[PDB]
Structure formats: C-alpha cells, structure tokens
Design an enzyme around this catalytic site. Structure first.
Site, PDB file in Angstrom:
ATOM      1  N   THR A   1     -25.633   2.422  14.475  1.00 17.14           N
ATOM      2  CA  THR A   1     -25.339   1.118  15.131  1.00 17.14           C
ATOM      3  C   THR A   1     -26.601   0.275  15.168  1.00 17.14           C
ATOM      4  O   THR A   1     -27.686   0.795  15.388  1.00 17.14           O
ATOM      5  CB  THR A   1     -24.806   1.301  16.549  1.00 17.14           C
ATOM      6  OG1 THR A   1     -24.867   0.047  17.222  1.00 17.14           O
ATOM      7  CG2 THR A   1     -25.621   2.326  17.315  1.00 17.14           C
ATOM      8  N   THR A   2     -26.464  -1.017  14.920  1.00 13.21           N
ATOM      9  CA  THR A   2     -27.614  -1.899  14.905  1.00 13.21           C
ATOM     10  C   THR A   2     -27.252  -3.289  15.394  1.00 13.21           C
ATOM     11  O   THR A   2     -26.150  -3.783  15.155  1.00 13.21           O
ATOM     12  CB  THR A   2     -28.262  -1.953  13.498  1.00 13.21           C
ATOM     13  OG1 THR A   2     -28.912  -3.210  13.298  1.00 13.21           O
ATOM     14  CG2 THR A   2     -27.248  -1.750  12.432  1.00 13.21           C
TER      15      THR A   2
END
Lengths: 203, 221, 221, 221, 221, 203, 203, 221, 203
Positions: free
Chosen positions: F1-2
């Site tokens: 996740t970013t």
C-alpha cells in the site's frame, strides 16, 4: 540529530541541525529542534519526536501561565527543576527524550536533562547523535573569553563537524542567541549559511 | 436554587445584586483593536497602588476585567487562564476567543442548577483579538454571554451604557476612542466628581496587549 | 421535585413559565423540506447583531431553535451536538433524527425526577431532514416530545399556533411557506406592530441547510 | 416518600392521580391471542397523526400501552425494551413474559422507597403471547402487577372495566372481541359522543403482532 | 426514622398499619410437617384466578406467605429466594431455615435506621422443614422474628390467633389440622360470611411441598 | 500500500492506490485509503485497517463539531497537533498506523504523523509499503514550480512505479486535489485511468 | 471451515459448509455457520466458536432493538460499522473471529470484518480455512451478469472444491439467498443436495 | 451559604464578626524590609508565656500573623506551610510570595460556596521578602486579598489603621518604623492603658527573619 | 475419564465411568461425573475437578431459581446458552472444563460445551480422555432406530471399550436415562454390572 548549548560572558547560544530520520531512511530534511520557550529562554529537543513535541508544548504553556500569575519570568534553574520533576515522576514509562535548556535570568545558564529527570548545569553541553564529535571540537576550541560573535562561529563549526561523522545529522544548521539586551533572537538563515561559506565549511 | 412560581431563579437574581455593588468598568471596539477601561477607586494611602489591578491578562492577546464578589472573580479568572492554556496545548492555538468565554460561562451555568452550591456572584468581560478579529464579550452570574460593539459593567452600568448607546462612534481611532470612553466612564459614576485614576489597556490587531502607564492615562484624564 | 395532591410537578410547571417569557419562534414542514423562523428582537445598537443567533445548527442536516433560559438552552444545544456526533461515529450515519431529540429529551426528563437539581428551564424544536424525510419535533422542560406538521414556541406560541391551526397549507412551496410563516409570526407577537428583523433558515430533501441572508429575509418582511 | 399515620405512601397516591388524567386504554384475551386498544384522541390538524403511537412494541411478540406522564412512560418503555433483549441474549429466549413485566415493576418499586427521587407517574399494561400462552398484565406507579382476562387503564378505567366486568365474553373470536372492546371503550369515555380514531393491535398464538391499519379499525368504528 | 421522646420509631409503627390492611393468612405445625393457608379473596371475573398466588415457594422445602404493600412483599420474596440459593451454593445445603429468615429480617432492619429510605411495609411468615425439623417463623416490618407452633398474619390476625390460642391441638394429623386452620380462618375474617376460595399448601418431613388443588381445598371448605 | 501528499503553489494533491492484503494473500482489490475529512482537508490511511478506520471517523466528527462550535474551519497545523496528541497519549498501546494529513487554510500544508504522535510538515511526503520507490521518483522529478496538472501526473507516475516494485501495493490508483477555489475534489475514475493510458503506464 | 458471500444484480447469496473440528479430530459434523441476523441481512461465522456465537447474539439483539427504536431496519454499512467499532475497541483481547455480513438495503452488500475491526466491502468474499480454493474458482467463474440461480450453483461448486482440498471443511453445504422481494430465504436441504447431484459434485 | 436579597453572604459576614473579636496586630513595609507586630495580651501567671506565639513562620523568609477563631487560624497556617514547601519542592524556590497567599485564600473562598461546610472564621496577614522584594498581604474569611504599604488586623483595626493612615512614614528605617508601629498599636487598643508585652518580628531584604527578644521589644515598649 | 451422551427417539441416555487420576497416579477410584441438574436434565463433567464442581453447583442453583420464578423448566438450549455465555465471558482465565449437557424439553437434546463457551448440539457426543475410542464404536454401531434398552447397552459397550485403550478412564461405569415419562432416572448399580456380565464385557 545534534544540538548544543554554550555559555559565555553575557549570553547563551543554542544551535542544532535539523535532519529527522527513520533508521537510515532520512525522511524529513527540515525538522525544527530549537524552540523559544520564554522571553529569555530556549530549549533543544533530541530523541523521539512525539515525546519531544508534546513536552515542548507543556513546557511552553506551563511557563506562560506562571509568568502571568507571578508577574515575573520563571528562573532557568526553576524551569529545569520543573522539567526534572516531570520526567522522573514517570521514569518507568518515560518520555524518551534528551533535553537541553538554556536561558538567562540573573546570569546565563544551560542545563542538560535526561529521560529520568536527572538535571545538571555546565558551561556548554551537546546533545543527541552527534554529541561526541562536537564535544571534541568544543573541548578543543571553546574559551569563556569568547565574544558572542566568536561563539556563533564555534557553534556552527562544531555542528558542521558532527554533520561529517554522523549520518543521523544533517540539513541546515540554525542558531539562536539569547542575551538580556535583545532577548532570544534566532539568526537569519542567510547570515548563517553566509558564515558557513566564510568559514569554508559545507552544506 | 429552583424556580419561582413566575419562572425565575431568585438566587441568581440576588447574585446579580452583588455585582451591581461592584466597581464600574467598560470596553469597546474601535479602529483596529479593542480597549478596556476600569475605574480604579482607591482608599487609603496604605494600599499598594497598582497591585489592585482590575484589568487582568488571560494571555498576551486576551484580557478580561471583572466586577462583583472579588474572591469569586479571581478564582473564575484563573479558571479562564488555565482553560486558555488547555486549548493552546491541544490545538496548538486559541483560534476563537468566543469559545474561551463559553467555557467559563458554562462553568458558571453549572452552579445555577446543581443543587448544593452557591452561584458565582460576579460578571466579567473578555476582550481581545482572535482569528476572527477584535472581540468583546460580557458574562453574568447566570452564565449568559453576549458579544458587543461596546459595553460596560459594574456599578455605573446603566449610566455609561446609555452614554455610549448615544455617542458611540463606530470606527473611532484609538486616541479618540479612549477619550469617548473615559468621558463616558466619567459621566456615569462621576456623580462624585473626581474620576480618580482610571486603569486602561488596549490591544490592536497584529500585536500583543498594551497596558497604559500612569502618565499616559493621566494625559487623557 | 415531587407530586402535588393533584398529581402535578409544580417545579416543572414553573419551569414552563420561564419558557413562556422567552422569544417567539416556529417552524413548519413544506413542499419537500422544512423551515425554521425565529423573531430576532434586538435592543441596543451596541449589540453585535447576527452574533445573537437563535437558530443553531446541530449538523448540516439538522437545526434547532430554543426558547427559555438562555444558559440552559445553550448547554442543552451542545449536548445535542455531541450526541449527534456520537451516533455518527458509532453507526456511521444519523439515520433517524427522532432518536436525537429523544436523547436530549430523556436528559431533561432525568432532572424531572432525580432529586437535588433544577429542571432545564427551556423548550426547543428540532427540524431537518433524516433517512425518513423532513422532520419536525418540539420538546418541553418536562421531556415531552411530539412531531408536528408545523408549530411554534416561546412567547407568542398560542397566538401563532392558532393562525397556522387555521391557515396552514399542507404542501406549500417554500417561497409561500416562508410567507405564511412570517405572516403567522407577525400576527402573533405583532401586538407591537414592528416585526423587526426575523431569523429564518430552511432545508430541503437532498441537500444541506441554508440560512437566509439579511436581504433575502428583508424581502419577505 | 414515607408512611402516613394510616399506613399509606402519599407520594405514590398522588402519582396515581396523574395516571387517572391520562388517556384511556384496554386489552383483553380472546380466542387464541390477545388484543390491545387505546383511544387516540387528537387535537390540531398540525400533529403528525400516527406518530403519536400509544401502543408500543417491546418485541415482535409483546407490546405494551401506557397512561400517565408521557415522559416517564417512554423512559419506562425503553427500559422494558432493553430489558427484553437482555433475557434473549443471555438465555437465548424470552420464555415467560411475566418476568419481563416483573423486572420493570421492580424498577418502579425502587423509587417507592429509595429516598431522594420522585415515583414514576405512569401505569401500563403489557400483553403478548409467551411460552405459556397469551398473557395480559397491568402495572401501576406502586409497582403492583396483576394478570387479567381483560382490563383497561387511564381515564375511563372504572367505566370500561365495569362494561367488561359485565359483558366480557370468555373465548370470544377476534372480530367480535375487538368489537366488544371498542364498544366498551366507546361507552366509557364516550360521554363526549365521538370515539374519534381508536388505536388497535392484536397478536395470536403462532405468530407476530399485527397493528390495525386506519381503514380496518375504521371498519369496526 | 428516629426516636420519639417515648422511645418509639413512629415510621416503623405506621408501616405496621399497612400490614394490618392486608389479606389474612396463617400457618401451623402439625403431625409431621407444617401447613400454610391464606384467604384468597377475589373481586372481578376479569382477574386471572390462580395467578394471584399468595403462598410462594422459596425452595421446594420452604415457602412463605406475605401481607402488606404488595410490591414490597414481592421484592422481599425474591431477595429471600436468591439468598436461599446463596447458602446452597456455598455450603451445598440449606441446613437451618432459621438462618434464611434471619438474613431477610436483617435486610428489613437496616431500613429501620439507615436514614434516607422508607421501611418495608410488609410482614411475612416462612414455613418449611429443615435439618432440625418442621419450622414456622414470622417477620414484621421492624425485623422482629419469632418461631411459633402456629400463628397468623394480616387483617384477621388478632381474631384467628385467638381462635388458635384457644383451640389449637398439638400434634394434629394433617387432615384435621387443615380443618382446624380453615375453621379458624373462617371465624376470623368471616364477619362477611363467605370464606370464598382459600389458598392452602402443606409439606411433611421427608418430602417436598404440596400445594392443594382447587377441588381438594374445596373439600374442606 | 502506498500514499503520497504533495504541496505546490496554491493547491495540494493526495493520492493512493488501493489494494488491501494479508501477507501475500491479496484479499481486497478495492479498499479506500483517501478520505476527505473537512471542506478543505483530506487524510490518507496506511497501516492496520481497524485502527485506521476508527481514527478516520474520530477525526471526522471532531472536526465537524469544532467547525460548528467555532464557526470557522480547524487549521491544518491544528488537526495535525490534535491527531499528534491523540496518538502519543497512547504510545504504549498505539494505533498501529501511519497518517498523512494535507489540506489548505491560509496556505497549502501536508503533515506526516507517526504512531507515537510525531508530527512533521514537509513539501511532500509519501507513506506506506512503497514509500521509498515514490520518494525516489519524487526526489527525482518534483518541482515546486509545477502546475496542478503536472502534479496529478507526477503523482500517478510515482504511485505506478511503486506498484511495480512492491507487491503490497496495487489496484486502481486514485487522486484528490484540494484547492481553495474549488475545495477538496476527488478526480473521476475515468480521467485518472485516461492519464494512465496517455502516460504509457500500466494497470 | 469455509463460508462465502457473493453479490449479484439484485440479491446476495451466502453459503457455508458445516464441519466443526478440533485440529484433526473432527468432532461435530453439523454445526451452523449461517445465520439470519435481520429481515434483510445475514452473517457467516468463522473462527473460534465461543466468540463467534456470542458475537452473533449481541448482533442479533442489537439490531432488533434498533429496528423497534428507529422504526426502520439498520443499513448494512451501519451494522458493519457497529461490528467494526465493537471488535477494534477490544483489539488487545480480541474475539478471535472472521465475520462476513451480507444484506440488502438500498442495494446489495457484503462486508469482510477482521478481529481488529477492519471492515471492507467487496463484490464477493470468502472467509475461513478453505477461502483460497473458493477464491480460486470464484476468480475463475464469477460474473456480475449472473442470475441468482447461476449464483447458487457457483457457490455450491466453490464450497465443494474447497471441501476437496481442505480437511478442515466438510459436511452438508447450505445456502441462503437474500433478496428485497422475498427477503432472507434459506434453501431447503433437499434442493441443495439435488443440485450437488445434478452438477456431479459430491458429499 | 447563599445570597441575601441584597446580594450578600450572611454567613461570611458573621464570620468577619468573629475575627473582630480577636487580638490586634499589624505590619508595615519600611526601609528595606518589613516588620510584624502583635499585641500579646496575657492573663494568668499559669500560661506558658512565649508558647502563645501569634507571629508564625511559614519559612525562614515569610511569616504570618492571624486573628479570629484560633483553631481555624492554626489549621490554615499549616496549610500555608506545606503549601509553601510544595512550591519549593517542584520549582526549587518560592519566587513569588503573592502566589503562596493566593493559594491559602482560594482554600478559604471554596468554603464560601461549597455547601455543607462552615467558612473559616479567621483573617491573617503574610509578610516577608521574595524575588520581587519586601511584601505585605492581608486575607479575610471571604478569601479577599490585597497588598499594603502597611495595615493591621484584629480588634483594633480601624483605630490603628487610621493612625498609620495619617502618620505613616514611607521609607522609615527599622528602629523608627517599629517605633511608629508600637506607637500606633498603643493608641488603638490602648483604651486600656497598659500595652502589656508586644510580640515583634522583622526581616530585611538580603537575609532571614528576626524575632525580637523580650528585652529588645521592652526597649521600644 | 470418559463421558458420553446419546439421543434416540424419545429419550436421552448419558453415562460415564468414574476414575479420577493425578497423571499416572490413579488416586480416586470412585468419583462422580454424572449429575442430575434439573427434573428433566443432566450434565457430565470432564476436566479439572475444582472448576467442574463449582460449575455444577452454579448451574444447579441457577436452574432451580429460574424454575420457581418462571413457573416452567428451562429449555435445554437455554441452559446450554447460559453456560456458554458464562464460560466465554471468562475465556482468558477459563474454567478448564469440557461439559456435556443433555435433557429433554419439547424433544430430546444433547449439547457439547467447551471452555471458551462454544456450544453445539449433535445426536450423540463423547467427552473426555477416552472420547475417540467411544466415537469409534459409536460411529460404528449407533442407530437412531434403537430402543432405550439397546441404547443403554451400546453406551456400556462404548465406555467399556474406551476403558481398554485409555489408562485415564476406569472404575464402575454408570448411566442415567432421562425420558419425559419417568424423568431423569439413574440405573441401579447392579442392573448395570449385570448387563456388563451379560455382554461379556469386563470391570
């Protein structure tokens, strides 16, 4: 992260660099680690950010209130003491922080405070990751007979040195000098980097 | 404290009485700031002059003056003080001054209904400049609060309030503003001629509060 | 607070009196929304106009207007405010407004029986649009709650309530609705001719609350 | 609340008065279930009709109707509601309805002796079908509870109770049962001729409650 | 509750008044057990007969009958119920019944002196057979308790007690004992001729409580 | 996740991707990590969902209440400080989470907050499993003289990159730009994927 | 143990098998893992029985009460949220469970809730020991253009496959389909076993 | 304690009465310090002379003298004492003596409004030298506090206060200051001629408090 | 220790052996593991004696109290649920026990409850150190078309089998059959040992 407070004649100079990192991951290039805490006093933060920041706020407010209520500024030894009491009281679930507080009341002072509320005054002290390197150049060239201007240079040098041998330190080094005449004054970015250039230092 | 057959809290009413017997003071917005002015009526030579400050600071950008039971006023003031710090320490900035007075007001409103406890026999006004701009609020024992363009409190309330009610000038520049006021203060309580030494302080947007020095006030006197 | 030999709570009765001595306000459901209107009767020029808002929002989709002891009213409103937030944060959405009012009502009801504490000397009406549709409720010091098609409260309740009782038009479109209302309000308190500057706000299904600006209200005035 | 020299709790008595001044309602066991009926006496056109529900559900299989101080009633009802859920969640089933009423009865009884607190000025009856079969109980401010074959409460209690006392038919099938009831209700409060719109609901062993729609009730009316 | 200048708690006295106005009941030791009997005086046809049980079980081997404020009696009975269970779960067995009554007695005694709280307006009698043998105790609002060979309570106490005081037969075999009882009850309250339908229960050493059925009781009636 | 917040001239842009996984088992392809929290401010969640979600709700209500009571919007440095206090206060039983709050009051702002209440402002900052990769392209191509449009592209590219080097990130990338003029606005899904296509990127 | 929720057009189908085991010792062949929780909503339990069960009861009652008090059914997102709050609020002494709550309010819904209060909605999701296998077939043959009948079969196949590759799953598979028209309806045992046979499946 | 219809706390007033009935004492700032003087009026030969110290130390640099209810006075002093220590232990030094007095005053002010408790029937004055310099404060039962140049307390307040009010010499050096003092004290209470043995103590900036020995005071006597 | 409950037509049979041991040190030859808990219900204890016992007293009294107040006996699923709530409610400092509760209300029943409050009903189930063995012969010879007498024999056989392969089980095997007609009745020691003999079994 490295900070330092130094005492001389009728002034006290405090300076720090401002790199905030996560292990090797330098995530923030311009943190702030020098804070004016009262008309005639400042504080340098070093350690865990969260603990540091809330501690700065408490201190700040606590001081302002005292001022109003007592119609006079709280003495440096007094602020150090209060802070000592706060930290030790919770030593078993401590604010992982290393504080350095300087200011000038009847005379200049600078106290080094540890997470367990141990408080001690000296004529100059460094705090943080780069402590040793600076303590070296300080032990080497500091003289009580120095001028406020000589000091600011010394300080700048000292930090620039620690910036060289310590990956945890970096970014623009900034300084504040507090004297009874002008109060707590934070030197102008340009003026600082200027002396850097002049001194043949780097970054 | 309970309701009278006519829908009134007699105790709170009585409390108001105590405030009427208090010193006269007022305040008003002007040019780009707000000022406070209270009648410092002194007796003996033996009193330590200035030490009887009626205009007190809550924080460098907010002051308040009070009238009524002195002890009650003090404790209430300190409450306002620590309460101010609270907002500063959590939010990092006392953004709206209206809230500070609201909090002290509710403090007071509690004693209007929680049975066993005498109400705060004191009214006070808060003035200063906040995020919105210069602000002026008053507060009675009943916890009632209102924002004004100018107002007064204490003994000569009715009097001075009328004076302003008539001769209040909207955006009056400081010097003149302080004049209209001292005049207004004068007329009111000045049934006894001598205005004595008024206590005055003013702040303007952009900076910290300023308390007038003995000579400076005497100049308008 | 205890029962009279005729089965009445005199204290709560007296509390009702206090609310009768309050300002007058009303609200009514209309076409596809609901609107509120309060008589903003002002005195001195020194009052900060609008700052004396009688119609207060509890959330973008629900507002309330109150009458009676101002201090009491305020604290009561704020209670409603945090209570509103509570439901949202636990259920993720204020589905039925009727519940909100019920909670503030129970609060009041408590002081109707828990010994040592004075009853909330205030009545208020909630209105806005919820999961069910436009809704309108009123609440007295006793904790009594009812839903209406239209109603009023405060001083000129009886008067204004009758006018509607006779001339209220079911699904009246907003513009006319606000008219019927201002007329009704007028008749009532208007024994003293001048209606002054009424405070009016409205909402319609599908969107958030809209407060009428000085000029817009002056248009219906 | 204490004992009068004759062995009576005057406060509890006074409470009883309040319930007498409440609306009239009744319920009675019949064929294979039980029904509830209350006189919905309405005033203004401005009331939100049905929203003033007098017969309230505690659970799909049990409802109650109340008379007395509206506020106290609601809170008492909600208590009975959560209390119902409680038994369901712990034992996995509300086996005997009598218990539910007993628990709400005790709540009230407490206020009958615990000093600083006013008694619940309200009476209610619970009816529904449990594990034992169709059940009907009534409860007063004193916390007194009894099981009936049929009974009423509120204003016209004595009158309607008598009617039944005379013309109550044991295992009367629903349609006629509701008839006898509405007739009985009529007689009583019907000193004022118009029965208006009665509120009626019924349940029968084997399934969930059924509330009568406007037209259906109007059919018996 | 405090002492009158003659050394009496008037409130406890007034409470007793309330128990006088309660129904009449009695119990007596006999052959090898004990029996309880209360006058089940009913009113409307609308009451659910048996449901108005006056003799209640605390545990299969111990029952009690009560008189006075119905509600108080109830709450007091459940207390005795759980309290009985408590001893069973800790010691594994309710060895002495005398102890059970002592605990509930103490519960009542506390209200006789602990300030802000009304005394329990009820008297009851516990009977059953424990480790010692068949036992019969009575208890009043004052927390006073005594063990009898036979006794009564409620309205017709004085009357029925005298009958027994005179015609009580020591080791009377059940059938005759219950007769003596019903006769005694009769005479007493029977100023109004009809004994109606009494409620009677009996237990004998070695086994569990036996409640008489409508016909069985009607046999001695 | 970013996730990533970026500051420029008179606007702030925030975007994230949206894959929610349990180790290697990618369980939810379309989670939501970008949330508007007030008329002129947004927040990005990163870390343990349970903790993150509840924190977003608290934050949401708290601000709304404030707005109503203070009649004005809560400043960005204020929300951050609030959040800071909440988190630090419970550092010993922390909300395992990493928050990025951006918005615009008198000027654009974006703050990085850690699970101990450490809060710091930067001109841009990324958060989550793929932070490094984005910090790279950002460090490489970000320029404060960029236009709101150049920015939205920059961000899409940055996130795409991380999506390439980090198995924990994935799914449709989505952005929201907030300006004083239009307020907080979340770009329409098609326009984004369109830019993706035009940029020659993937997914 | 395996459970699955699948969303389609105007309905939500939910199914689970029903073997309850203690490691390898399969102790109960017929446990129940599918529960109706409200007129238009269902839930599938998976994890620690004790926790799961008591969790279903609270949910059950809480919902009923809500219905009575609000005169309307609680929205699916709302119930999910409640559950979320409840779970997360006790993360450090969690209900070791994995919940799936599906239902139909304004439109169909299906949420995956973890023991930490993480809540996320998807178009279909599996929970439990055999989740992977079913995720496999679903990923392979699910299509949002399916009819509720095609769905019920798909679900049966999915669980059947899982039953093959997972010793922790077993027993009679049972399904419940919930629609606005008919409400929550659980299919009759025979009808389910009939389709199994027709499909050529087993057990 | 509550407000009278004229806004006064009768209980606190009455309290004041009790202090008027106390011994007379005073103090005043002088050259570069401040002194305290109290009339030590003794009765029996059997008293342990000096042991009845009226001037009490709170710390080496701050003393206070009291008048009114003795018991109240003592307890209030110890409070000041530990309270003093408290500041020292946290901040490391008692910087402002004004603060110490404010604290003890607030303690008193609380009993002015917190229901069920009798206000402190005592007044006292604090004097000594702090970070600001030589200071002098007085405190009454209401919790009212002020700083003086000179002032008195007790029985002969009005008397001795006037004498100073007239003959008080600003920067009078110690020897003459004590003189003026003892002179003023004399006149006042000296309706009864003999001044008896006054208790006197003084401190000057730079050092610790000095209590005058029997002979030294007798010299000015 | 081994206990078993079995359901058939219109009765429920429960039986256990009665050896209480401390590891290999078999210290008590005649413990009691079968208890009547109410007119039409019994319960079998298995686990740590102390916890088991207190649990039986609670249940016992709780039941008796309910009867009196509700004028009806508590349904089997109810007593199970009750127990379930109790145990799970203290899962983190559990009553180390395994309870089997059977009885007959409108119909026969038999539930298996674990230390975490997981409760499940089956047509028969065993509990204890010897569970597997019985589950074997049970899985082999149990038939719902049996008679209360066939049952009693089956049970004895099962327990006798377990006694052979499990050193933790032993001593006199005792059974109690509960039917609506006669209620809960524990079979005479002699009649039991006779059947043993007749069956050619042992001990």
């Amino acid at each position: 992260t490295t900070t330092v407070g130094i005492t001389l004649k009728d002034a006290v100079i405090m300076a720090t660099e401002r790199r905030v990192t996560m292990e090797n991951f330098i995530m923030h290039k311009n943190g702030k680690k020098l804070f004016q805490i009262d008309t005639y006093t400042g504080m340098t933060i070093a350690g865990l950010v969260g603990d540091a920041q809330v501690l700065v706020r408490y201190m700040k407010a606590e001081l302002e209130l005292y001022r109003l209520q007592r119609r006079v500024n709280m003495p440096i030894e007094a602020v150090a003491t209060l802070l000592s009491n706060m930290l030790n009281q919770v030593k078993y679930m401590p604010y992982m922080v290393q504080l350095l507080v300087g200011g000038i009341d009847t005379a200049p002072h600078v106290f080094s405070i540890d997470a367990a509320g141990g408080s001690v005054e000296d004529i100059y002290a460094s705090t943080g990751s780069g402590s040793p390197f600076v303590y070296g150049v300080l032990e080497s060239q500091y003289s009580e007979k120095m001028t406020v201007d000589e000091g600011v240079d010394l300080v700048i040098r000292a930090i620039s040195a620690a910036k060289q041998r310590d990956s945890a330190s970096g970014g623009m080094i900034d300084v504040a000098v507090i004297t009874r005449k002008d109060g707590y004054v934070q030197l102008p970015t340009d003026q600082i980097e200027s002396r850097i250039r002049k001194l043949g230092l780097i970054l | 404290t309970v309701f009278s057959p006519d829908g009134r809290l007699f105790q709170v009413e009585y409390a108001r009485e105590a405030v009427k017997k208090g010193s006269t003071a007022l305040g008003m917005k002007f040019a780009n700031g707000v000022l406070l002015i209270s009648d410092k009526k002194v007796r003996s030579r033996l009193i330590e002059q200035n030490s009887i400050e009626k205009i007190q600071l809550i924080d460098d950008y907010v002051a308040a003056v009070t009238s009524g039971l002195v002890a009650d006023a003090r404790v209430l003031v300190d409450f306002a003080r620590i309460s101010a710090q609270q907002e500063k320490v959590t939010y990092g900035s006392l953004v709206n001054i209206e809230n500070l007075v609201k909090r002290v007001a509710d403090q007071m409103q509690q004693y209007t209904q929680y049975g066993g406890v005498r109400p705060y026999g004191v009214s006070l006004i808060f003035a200063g400049i906040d995020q919105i701009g210069p602000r002026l609020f008053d507060c009675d024992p009943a916890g009632t609060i209102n924002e004004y363009k100018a107002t007064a409190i204490g003994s000569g309330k009715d009097a001075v309030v009328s004076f302003l009610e008539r001769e209040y000038k909207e955006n009056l520049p400081e010097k003149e503003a302080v004049t209209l006021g001292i005049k207004a203060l004068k007329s009111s309580l000045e049934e006894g001629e001598e205005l004595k030494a008024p206590e005055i302080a003013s702040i303007t947007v952009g900076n910290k509060y300023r308390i007038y020095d003995q000579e400076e006030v005497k100049k308008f006197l």
